[PDB]
Symmetry: D2
Subunit: 472 residues, 4 copies
């Protein structure tokens, strides 16, 4: 029986959810495509159903969004920022139940579910002010009586494809900034977080309808692979923002490039921690634990590779092993719990395979490596030592709490080993040596977009620039 039909989950109805939910919103709610059931990863029980977009739904929705844009693009940016402010306030009102739904359907602990909704709220609060800052300079022409104007306009329709692990806030960022920039949006979320997508869209739709705005400004088309591919290939989708796996993202980027569209790609990858000989272990161990096991190792920034100096290697591994043992585990929406399940059964399979492949490559499991004997998709947070830095399994990005630990002797080699990684998303170093930090942050250092040490024009990405020369 569906969780939403059990009295103990009656709070779900506060988000306007029912047994079967419309998964298409374009000003009207509908869905003639396949009906999907999503499941709670903490107990593998069905929660509720969503009727996804058909091809026809997608086509209709794109057309309606583009018609809505004619109205929306004419609303001045600060007034669009006011609408985004109101979306923020509406999320505020629902933050506990929406955060609870994030934990229920996705599996991250309650403080993280609520925190993700809060992030979207904070983004909306930020966008309000940013909406008053959109514009380009009037530059002087070389010719007298001529004006040189850097003009910024909406791109039109921004399609947004998001992933399971941040099913609210990635959409939130894209939506908020695309909206103040005068674009309309079309959201396709992860199918396994469809209820979350629907719940967020219901909140936004009410704000739009209360303001007598066409709902298709924030359209929703729940669906699987065929909907995502359609967006990628659709010339009417002026900008496609994709967050997800590298394999899918690469193909999305190629499809967009083939039709001369624009894309924003967040593909994540491997994240490394490097603890040098002089690191403060009081920081390294709790940092590595949180970065490794937080959200059950399913973050884009999850630490999967830990490089430790030979001297402190064993102590750090020991203290990690001790730290891992005291990790509290349960239903993620129970305020007591610190560690929840993996998002799907498939991820549990990937976890087991990764552990096996790691052993078959020469690694020793010094902690965990097993599925937990309990309902749901729970696995033990795992530490593997003895692997070689060039190990194939280590370079692959399995969304599971497996920490691969590598030793090193000097700065030169470990820096080389890391710069040999391409997909690198973030690098976190722990050292007290200043010259070393500079080298790692500078031109010859990390290639990562995010670098951490011992721990503004974003709107232009959603607009198109023109140079306008005007003769008085």
């Amino acid at each position: 029986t569906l969780l939403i039909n059990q009295p103990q989950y009656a709070w779900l109805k506060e988000l306007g959810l029912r047994e079967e939910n419309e998964g298409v919103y374009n000003g009207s709610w509908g869905g003639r495509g396949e009906v999907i059931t999503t499941y709670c990863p903490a107990n593998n029980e069905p929660i509720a159903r969503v009727r996804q977009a058909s091809v026809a739904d997608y086509e209709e929705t794109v057309k309606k969004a583009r018609e809505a844009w004619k109205i929306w693009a004419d609303i001045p940016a600060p007034k669009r920022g006011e609408i985004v402010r109101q979306i923020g306030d509406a999320l505020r009102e629902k933050i506990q139940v929406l955060g609870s739904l994030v934990s229920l359907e996705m599996g991250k602990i309650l403080v993280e579910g609520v925190g993700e909704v809060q992030e979207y709220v904070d983004i909306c609060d930020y966008a309000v002010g940013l909406s008053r800052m959109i514009g380009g300079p009037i530059l002087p022409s070389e010719r007298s009586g001529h004006a040189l104007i850097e003009q910024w306009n909406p791109v039109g329709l921004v399609g947004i494809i998001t992933a399971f692990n941040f099913p609210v806030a990635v959409y939130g960022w894209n939506n908020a900034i695309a909206m103040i920039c005068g674009n309309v949006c079309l959201w396709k979320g992860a199918p396994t977080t469809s209820l979350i997508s629907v719940a967020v869209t219901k909140i936004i739709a009410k704000v739009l309808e209360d303001n007598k705005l066409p709902g298709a400004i924030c359209s929703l088309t729940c669906g699987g692979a065929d909907i995502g591919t359609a967006m990628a290939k659709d010339e009417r989708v002026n900008l496609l923002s994709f967050t997800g796996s590298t394999q899918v993202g690469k193909q999305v980027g190629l499809m967009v490039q083939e039709r001369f569209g624009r894309s924003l790609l967040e593909l994540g990858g491997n994240n490394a921690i490097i603890a040098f000989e002089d690191a403060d272990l009081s920081l390294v161990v709790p940092s590595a634990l949180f970065a490794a096991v937080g959200t059950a190792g399913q973050r884009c920034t999850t630490a999967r590779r830990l490089f430790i100096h030979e001297s402190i290697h064993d102590e750090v591994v020991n203290r990690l092993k001790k730290a891992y043992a005291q990790i509290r585990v349960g239903n993620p929406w129970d305020p007591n719990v610190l560690y929840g399940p993996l998002h799907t059964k498939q991820a549990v399979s990937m976890f087991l395979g990764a552990v096996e492949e790691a052993k078959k490559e020469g690694g020793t499991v010094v902690y965990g490596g097993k599925v937990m004997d309990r309902p749901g998709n729970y696995v033990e947070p795992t530490i593997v030592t003895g692997l070689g830095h060039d190990a194939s399994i280590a370079h692959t990005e399995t969304f599971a709490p497996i920490l691969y630990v590598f030793k090193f002797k000097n700065e030169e080699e470990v820096f080389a080993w890391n710069n040999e990684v391409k997909q690198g998303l973030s690098s976190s170093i722990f050292t007290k040596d200043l010259g070393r930090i500079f080298r790692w942050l500078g031109p010859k250092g990390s290639d990562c977009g995010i670098v951490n040490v011992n721990i503004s024009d974003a709107w232009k990405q959603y607009m198109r620039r023109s140079t306008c020369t005007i003769n008085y």
Copy 2:
């Protein structure tokens, strides 16, 4: 016999050119690939030869550039700007002979050849100041004792592929900004402007060498499609700037994306002029003429489509026919010619093809349309009427002076017609109606990246990589 071997062309030696020139520079000059002879389009005589890059040349050069980068990236941005300043000074010193070479090998008139070198000089002067402005903010973190730093670093090696029609200044822009940003560069110019590429590289090389810097900071590998494709597929080329045809550019773009590299593409597109009923004809006619026939119609920005209201379509065409009659065509060194030869014999064939194809699709040639019976690649400035706004030949960007003219009734018509084209390059409107102007420049107006009205500073971030660095100083 080679022009460079004739006494009257002895000035070419001021640019360090000889009968057979090395087309590879990486700190040393060389070239083991295929020879190419380039020709003067004014008389179709061979100028001199360049030995292009082999695969081994390319490999060695990419390696030397990346080694050079280790030194160059450590030189403070303002010191890099001083080098670029010296490059501008060195170009100044050679501006007349380098300008004359552009005219000799590529075929644009001398004021434009010199003017193109001057643009590169002005870019270097600009880059000097810009080099003191490169960096990102330190922002306060929400967490006490933490700092958020927006860090900008060089991408590494910037490959630069350029086209025949601006064989100096496009490279110049890319080179100057890439340099101050701490990158090293690798240039592959158009094969038919190989001498120009060598001459520019000789000028830059001497500045680098005089400053005791590794010359591969500004490397050159002359070649054709094979070198260009190698660069596009090469992971060591961190950023690839391409200027040229849409067909080639699209392939280059896909290859770079396949390896998750970075590209900057300039693929051009068509350029339209729209004269409304209330347009000042005093502006419309000369603006259209110069935009259409400047550089013999071989600019990226060349106007190839002129929409005129049914109202004044008849008159503007008549006034254009009379004005076109007075266009003087001739040798690029002649101070009294408006434009010179097409760049290639092939381009002349393309001109004749477009003219005939236009006729087959119902067009009337109301002026020009013929090849001039004289040595070189000279064609008449041409105007074609009666075509439909969707005629497949008018949307083809023929690099020749062919101006297609269309009539229209309403603003809604012509605006739809014009935004039916796939990402045109520039739109130039002539009107007095200020509401129409706000419309055309606004969100529901032209999709072109260049819009002009009554006429025919963060750029460095494109050449760098951003990181967000969070530092716990508590």
Copy 3:
């Protein structure tokens, strides 16, 4: 008897007001200086009393604010922005009663009173985002291993002196931006809007107190010229923001400069409207009316001079006379009135003085010019013609609805006439001539800081101090 003691005014207690209120806040409420009773200008009845700051109160408060700063300056800018966000939320919660108080004590109509509080709310919402944007660049030094950092720090204590006509939002802007910049503030509002200042401070104080922050971050010392002068001469007041009359502001400016402090002065100036011969009268007449009589002519931006071409001077005045006849004047709480009473009885006297003085200088009162025979400070919306553009009374900024009208022949005349005034505040032109518009907005046009055409993000740097920090990391 005090309005606040009458049952129908019991809503004032929602703002924490009583019969006699403390006018000093520095974390605790107090006030040992002189009492002041403020009056409702709609009926000239006393509302309630405020005990103002003594010298001892001021001293203690400045000391407590500077002690509070030691804590506040260490709170990360985005965390400071979250406090300002909460202040905006707290204002929202009280917007109707706080708006009603602005209308009750100051006299502007309720939609403007509420609208003024809404502006402060919108400013707080804006400041939240701006707080994440505060900082300067790290630039590369010309010297290897050296870094150039543009560092921004709070100035310390920001004194804020505000005027009667916007007794909430001017303080709000200064307070919100000063706060996110890491400064503490000290407010001295207009004496005749003391209850408003106390009410706003009570709202902010609760947010600070609830957040366990020292309340003197947003201190209040109610007083008159003596407190204002103390702030101007006080070295501990690092930055003094003053809004008010030019005469007072100039003195304040000189006092601050004498001690090498920093000031921000808003001194207003006149506001002119220029309707040319080609002006759309459909715009001119209502724009002029609303600009002239909005808030009973008591805005800094109130239009007091209307220049009209000799061409249409006759008609626009006639159409204005008819429109003025339909202006409804009455109680600020009445939703169907365009404006209410003047702020003070003295202002009514000033109105009559200007009207008579105008007549003595040759002016014709073509509409209004009288005091309305009813309780409160009500005057008729007034239009005066026949004055010369240099008449000394028309250049006086009388805070009352008096509109002086002048005719002119040529553009050169009216532009000279208008830029003869000493730094006017705003210029609003109505014309179709686009060249005239470029002229008026350009280097040889208006010197006003506000220019409007066919209508009547680094700001945080003003509240901080910049340092260039060079660090040898080699």
Copy 4:
């Protein structure tokens, strides 16, 4: 006899100088005011004469500058930047003789005279690019169909008053930026550097005349106090840039404020060096020597107060004393010399008085303190120890090489002592302690505008901003 009449100084004629020089330039050269003779401080010999502006000259020049502005303001900013580029090139051509004149008339060593001309060249090279960056954004209005434009216009006439110690490059900065911003300028330099002012103005005037521009765009009115005061009180001088002493500058600022004008004031003051216990003395001593004795202690940034930790105090003083002894002294234009004379006889008097007052306040002269027995205005570079931090003589800014040395025990006190100074121009700390550097650079640290550790919108200052709201 005048130096310019001696064959050995015939190189002066390369700058267009003669026995008596016109000190007014407004497109024509003139001067009906007082005739001044300037003197070489290395030998107290007269160099040449300059006929200064009368009141009438000043009045005429202001009017002509303002007429020239009508033409100049209509030249697009990048074309104005080209004129500034050409001024740069023209200085380049004269750099050796102009630098030599700086050494001759002002007294700073040759490398510094040439270096100051080079700074102006570099400023011109910078201004060329900056000229393409002048403008404000078009921001979105809250009202539909309305445009919000941040407009920047020239202020008009920028008066520039400069001092003896940087008689070329301060004017150069003001001139170059004011020019690209579309302003005309009026220069009044230090009377004791009048030949330098004339020589620079001749270089600029030729560039303007070659370009068929009205010379008054860069006007010159040489004069003393009455000319400076006239500029300060003149409503036609829209912006007054003053560099000089605090007493004069304060009065200039008050005069400008009285008439609601705009001013830019550079008043300099005291500069302190703080060497903590952990400082690298290998840096501290040569840094202190150069900052103290460079340009004979006549820089705006000259170090006059040295705070040293008790532990290293004596060693640093010793090594300074040893370093001071090997200082090479001679004619400043002789390429061999490292230390020249003070700029005037009056400064030598101030030097002697400061030394005497320092003794009478309790200080010990551990080196120097005497005038040198030789022609010119030469004094010994001086180190005074034993003074109290609150000493009156130490807080005063005498343009002479007197280094006052103070001891301290801990961070708290020395920071307090320094924050007790108001006029503080720069602060230079030497320490390896990171927390300490942060404290000194942060909100609770130095109040100085320039802070050194172990060693862009400038155009807006010369323009006026308006907010322009336009209804389509």
